[PDB]
Design a protein around this ligand. Structure first.
Ligand code: ATP
Ligand code: KVR
Length: 337
């Protein structure tokens, strides 16, 4: 609402509103909609097919407001607009149209066909965002009405399966709104009022949202199974490919601290290809979904090694040892974050 409309948009939006009005009535007659005295969509009768003057002024004004919200929404998207020229707006060609596609009046509303104009990926993205905003303004109205979501539409209980996020919306209506949006944006472009998209903003949430406030969960064997000597091996399977750590931990490990940040644990972060013990150093490569990581420790020469799907993971050098030397201490147990 805080947005103020430029005069060139003001002298463009009345012509926009009319043009899309006839766009709407041509879409209606192409799909096979007929004129009728009564307000019955199932019986295929509606006085809406006549010109906007004979059309109910409520709908005609609603169309103008509908377009006004659309203009204010292009402006609020951060999509700045430029004026290409004036003569292409003064002179707009008209396709020849078939009689069956024509209504009772001989006037052909379909203006210079938008097929010449091509939709860039950014122009499609803003079409998606306009569709999202229209759906959201559609649902704010329904919620104000008190209509709530329901798996099956209820006329009396005011339940519409339609009140869902646009991503979850049914493909039929989503496409129908999308087409009118797409044709609306193309009509805006064909008015010579070329729109330049805001720069692509990259936003990564890094999965801050989590159960309560826990960032990670640590799974380990019981402290009584600590190994002090010998050769030991266990395997860790990665169903997903995200922030994981696997390795050997001392019985003094804190469940709230990250693996390898302190001296109590030795871990391998394949997500960043990092080996973790009081710091991170580059080691090995990254895993994908389904990769199996093997962990081997030999407390005789105090070495630690790792395998990704069988092959030995190396550090920056040619050495196969993730942690060359450590102390036996109290022992080690398998651990995973
Ligand atoms: N001239 C017009 N300008 C703008 N929008 C219009 C116009 N005529 C009809 N509409 C649209 O028609 C729709 C009316 O049906 P709607 O999709 O809201 O059904 P609904 O969700 O079942 O509604 P309700 O919950 O009120 O029963 C609205 O989204 C409204 O924006
Ligand atoms: C979405 O902005 C507009 C702007 C202009 C016009 C329409 C829609 C189309 N309408 C017909 C209509 C009425 C109700 C429904 C419905 O029940 O959803 C669907 C179509 C009015 C004539 S021009």
């Amino acid at each position: 609402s805080q947005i103020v409309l430029p005069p060139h948009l003001e002298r463009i939006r009345e012509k926009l509103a009319e043009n899309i009005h006839e766009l709407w009535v041509m879409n209606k007659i192409e799909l096979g909609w007929q004129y009728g005295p009564v307000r019955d969509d199932n019986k295929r009768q509606h006085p809406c097919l006549v010109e906007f003057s004979k059309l109910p002024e409520q709908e005609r004004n609603y169309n103008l407001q509908m377009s006004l919200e659309t203009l204010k929404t292009l402006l609020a998207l951060g999509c700045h607009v430029g004026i290409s020229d004036e003569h292409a707006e003064d002179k707009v060609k008209k396709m020849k149209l078939p009689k069956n596609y024509q209504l009772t009046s001989g006037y052909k509303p379909a203006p210079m066909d938008l097929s010449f104009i091509k939709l860039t990926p950014s122009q499609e993205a803003m079409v998606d965002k306009l569709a999202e905003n229209a759906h959201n303004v559609w649902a704010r109205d329904r919620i104000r009405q008190g209509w709530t979501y329901g798996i099956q539409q209820d006329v009396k209980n005011r339940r519409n399966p339609r009140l869902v996020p646009y991503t979850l919306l049914d493909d039929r209506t989503k496409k129908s709104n999308k087409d009118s949006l797409r044709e609306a944006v193309r009509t805006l472009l064909g008015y010579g009022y070329n729109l330049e998209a805001p720069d692509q903003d990259h936003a990564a949430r890094a999965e801050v949202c989590s159960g309560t406030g826990e960032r990670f969960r640590i799974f380990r064997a019981e402290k009584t199974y600590a190994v002090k000597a010998g050769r030991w091996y266990f395997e860790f399977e990665t169903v997903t490919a995200g922030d994981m750590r696997v390795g050997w931990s001392r019985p003094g490990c804190q469940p709230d601290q990250e693996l390898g940040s302190d001296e109590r644990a030795f871990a391998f972060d394949g997500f960043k290809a990092q080996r973790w013990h009081q710091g991170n150093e580059h080691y090995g490569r990254s895993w994908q979904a389904g990769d199996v990581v093997g962990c081997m420790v030999d407390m005789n020469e105090h070495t630690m090694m790792f395998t990704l799907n069988g092959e030995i993971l190396l550090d920056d050098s040619g050495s196969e040892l993730a942690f060359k030397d450590f102390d036996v201490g109290d022992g080690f147990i398998p651990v995973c974050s």
